[model samples]
Target chain A: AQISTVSGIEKLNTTLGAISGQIDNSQSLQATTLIGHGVMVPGTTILAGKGAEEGAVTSTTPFGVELQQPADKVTATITDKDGRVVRTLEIGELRAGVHTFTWDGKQTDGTTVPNGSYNIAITASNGGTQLVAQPLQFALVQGVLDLGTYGTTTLDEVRQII
Target chain B: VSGIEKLNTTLGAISGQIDNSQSLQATTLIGHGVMVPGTTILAGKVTSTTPFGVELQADKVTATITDKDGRVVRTLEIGELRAGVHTFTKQTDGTTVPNGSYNIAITASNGGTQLVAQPLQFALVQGVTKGSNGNLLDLGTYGTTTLDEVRQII
Candidate 1:
């Protein structure tokens, strides 16, 4: 019985070592792939996910927008290609990160916006004064990649699809 | 070993593996200009002396900086000034402040009526690079971009 117990402990350690090895290799390869392919563009949110494969479903999958800083009482104005304000989204005190807002493809007055490109303008003010924010719209990431490298240093390049 | 003990041992191994992988990912960020999502200003020092000014809508204003404990650390008083953007260059006594987090509270008055002003929060951080314009911090270089046309013909 004592000999069998020693063999079991050795087998457990070996399995753990293999798991750790696989994790290390995967992380290294993921970082390398991300360094060569990450991209961003300046535009408005159209589809939250690129397609059904990218988590785009028929339900309430919101079109996401990324922010560099914490915004207070922010408002997003969605405009049509003709520069007409269609919808106004009031986002209050959003923390700094990738935030997604849903659009039912309708105007503020209950009119459906035609399928085409649209523009988004975001305005925010911290308590005392307003902070200058650039027009940063989230575009479709061409491929599904590791979430850990998003907005981090491992990202490589950013190209706009226009 | 019991079944529960075996499960615990496996979970512990997986957790240790994840930690090692995460550290490996962090090491790849070294020597890269990664966009860190937060305030660029560090703690301990003011990046520049450029007027950290604010636009006022009233003529008479009293601005003060208080510590996190709400203790007044510095104050500046201005009167008879126009209602526009005004720069606060120094302390009320015309001196620099030490490194810490401070809240800038401003009170403006027009004659006997008091006007409402929102207070601002700021922190004095260390290792922030000052730009040429005397601004609080130097972000980076800015330049105009030109468009180029690309065509592929067979």
Candidate 2:
């Protein structure tokens, strides 16, 4: 009877361990293929990096903005980590929709800015009453983490891909 | 002249890369059906169920399915449909239709005046041919259509 009880508990633990292993392997396999893809996540930071298209110059990076309703005036900004204003984006008088715009990765004086995580901000108003804005940042999936003794990796939920 | 040659070589590489990218995109769309603005329904044995659509521009719409010989196969009495696009499967009571090309004839009206209505057809993209005009998608019996005309992949 004591052996039976011990075996039952051991079987349950083994089954649970198998399930966790299965899920971890599935996630690990899926992440293996998606190694070099940019996922458009929800944030305010945008990246400016060197690209093959721009050659010698820092290429412009695109970001998405969604507005729930019409706004009288909408002005978006790109600022550095030290809170120095760089370039201003041209998004004027949009009428209740989501649109993508690119920043030239240059200053307002048309000079190139250093490659890093430049934060995005917006000032939108409808008849002087500020309207809400949602920022969609493009983040490259660097790598997936592994944590499984049940032997698995815990992957977070995904939204849109770039 | 030396710098000019260097720039020209880079441009040639970029152009060839663009062609390769276009070829890759068209090849991936093989065997996938796409919705486009056309009058013919490319129905055949390849697809399990045939899907078609009607783009209405008025308050009332009446559509009919016709064969190649301009013979009426079936009439759809879609009266007083909304002024938008609607899609569905081609249904008839008798039996399975003879595998061939079928066209949709739509008559629409607003109040009493006639309005323009475009028929949308779902055609399977079999193969792609590069031409001077555009990327010609061979839509079987529905004939060749350009890639720019594709609405979305189904």
Candidate 3:
């Protein structure tokens, strides 16, 4: 049946709109998946935190704790603005490189911490005694680019790299 | 053709067109500069007397001019220039060139190892006849160009 009328066109438009809505939903889901696990540049410091209000850094992703020396055991203590220990992450035997740690933006009691500046201290111990494990910069994954020579991941912010 | 079929065909054609156009734009932007993702490259050229220059969108750009055979012709130690378009001409060292091909290489660094490099290819052809009193006339611009590229010419 050749239903080439205005009503038929209107039905077609509604169907297209429904399909567009489904696509939008799918995109939202994908974005939500990225809320936690974002990519980081290879050499970026893991000292990611917020900045001043004007040019504030977005802290949706978790903190990346980069260790300089290979340690048998490592502990990350995250303190809140009031110097209170909110969360502690005990990483067991990690290779010397950048490692992603998801703080879940929460406290010890599963309560969401206020989104702002927080201090993270990473301490590591090689099999016997305490070894000075340098903390790289902290930041959220901004973007990744594969330059011919190397691959770089732009981070939200970095304290410093020494 | 039926209205539904016509609409479907139009949508398919539009989707393909958008995808191709976007891919081309991305490739073109990256190809122009030595893609460092977040960094910008100084890409531009200058004629003998027509003010050679480079457009900077970042800071700490070490722009150098070399000959066709990889000889250091001139070096520009640029400073922190607020993102904008900047231009400069060949400096007057009280001597004129013998006319040949030259190359310009600009590299922007982040005060450390992070750098974005781009090559600007330009040639210097001898201009004006010999008896016309145009022996590389002094443009009143003396002294070598320093880190202050923003104030060199324009």
Candidate 4:
């Protein structure tokens, strides 16, 4: 029963694992419209597992990256390894220029997803007209692992194994 | 080749009496490794040899030597040398020699090396939180005075 509860949470947190950057004060890499959530107050830190043995996740969680412009809708398209779109996560509209959003590593149904490495493709529009642009996005690799027993699974990308 | 050989011999004879080589008993020694905090380590003397035949002696229990690139270059074994003052000839290894920083890691648990500490390098931008205060206060300028007077059909 305890194992089942952990499984449920794992599925939900998969969405949280998709966080990408929102604001950049560093370089002028060309700004478009804002997509997803850029930066937020209080932000978020991810925690995983249970019991005293549960490990802590660091701030280097890998997330998705996309470019956004104002007056355009923000949406995240989750694709499988083959680039086939599995689902599109609905996001809010933005005014103009670059923005960022993070996935809580969960699906819409609130089930935690398995931990693994994945890539994100950003599509955004300038105002009402859809614009074609490519924005740089990255996720730091934590480590890859195969969970045995029920199935092969992975731990959170930011989690370090003891 | 014969003339060069005679010149080399002559140079060697001149330098032999000058004592150009460093004595292993008088040279400096050192160690290097990433360390955990709150750990007490010993830095003392050591002696080792170079591949080209240059011998070194650690004046202290440990000598710190770092390369220009900021990486540790000392390859002394933690298990082999005692906690203090090692006097043995060692051959220099590594493509780049003489590291930028050197520190001995002596702290361990159950006879095993302790884990290294991670460096934290992120900080939040100041005043960013306070700058976001106050909602869209331009409602009155838009000709909408009160929340109800704008329009409420009873």
Identify the candidate with maximal lDDT: 2
Backbone clashes in model 3, listed as residue pairs: A41-A153, A45-A137, A46-A136, A46-A137, A46-A138, A47-A137, A47-A138, A48-A138, A48-A139, B46-B52
lDDT of 3 by residue, A65-100 (tens): 566677798888877667788888787888876666
Give a tens-digit lDDT track for model 4, residues A1-162: 666556545543442332111111111011111111121111122222323444733222323333344545555566545565544666666655444555666544666545444345556665567765443333222111211111112222212221
lDDT of each residue in B2-53, candidate 3, tens digit only: 7576786676565444433433332222211111111112233323533343
True contacts kept of each: 0.00, 0.00, 0.02, 0.00
What TM value does the first chain of each candidate achieve?
A: 0.50, 0.62, 0.47, 0.41
Instruction: List the pairs of residues colliding in candidate 1.
Output: A39-A158, A40-A158, B42-B125, B43-B125, B43-B126, B44-B124, B44-B125, B45-B125, B50-B134
Sorting all predicted structures by TM-score, with the top scorer first, yields 2, 3, 1, 4
A49 Cα displacement, candidate 3 (Å): 13
Model 1 agreement with the true structure over A56-131: per-residue lDDT tens digits: 4433223445556677777778776678787898877877665555667667888555545667787766775675
- Best by DockQ, which number? 3
Which of candidates 1 and 3 is the stronger one according to lDDT? Answer: 1
Q: Tens digit of lDDT per residue, candidate 2, span B22-58? A: 5556665666666678877655562454666666536
Q: CA shift at A58, candidate 2, in angstroms?
A: 55
Best by TM-score: 2
Give the whole-model CA lDDT for all candidates, comma-separated.
Answer: 0.46, 0.64, 0.45, 0.30
Model 1: per-residue Cα lDDT over B1-154, one tens digit each: 5654586577676755564454354343333222111111123344443223344446677766666666676666656456533333334466665555455566777885777543322222222242232112212221111000000000
Model 4 per-residue lDDT tens digits across residues B5-26: 4544554454332221211110
